[PDB]
Amino acid sequence: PGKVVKFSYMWTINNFSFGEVIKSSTFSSGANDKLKWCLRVNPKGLDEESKDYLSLYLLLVSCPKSEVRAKFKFSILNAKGEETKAMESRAYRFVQGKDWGFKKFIRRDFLLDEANGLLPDDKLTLFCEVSVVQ
């Protein structure tokens, strides 16, 4: 079977301003949709170090064998549709149930300032691009 080896996932969280986690829908890649992924966001930070930030992680929900190696990039789509505030990974080794990401992905006060155009209509749109190399 063929494999989806690169994929880009777009997720809009409504009423954003409203260590606790929001998890995205699960999305599939690989052969026969056998790699399953989701995004995890901590809107108020992972911990004390990151209180002032949103934290963002890519989680390998399911895989058929031992491990998956993948490179990834996260960004925000602004009120115009443009990518902004990107952070990118080398390939990292994921195992099922494990994640990789940025505990200090973006500052909350920047995100919540309407001047920046990152929460049009109080919606946060995240964009994750993944390239699976093994």
Partner: peptide
């Protein structure tokens, strides 16, 4: 600033 797991 490098990726880390959440747990």
């Amino acid at each position: 600033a490098s990726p880390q797991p959440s747990s």
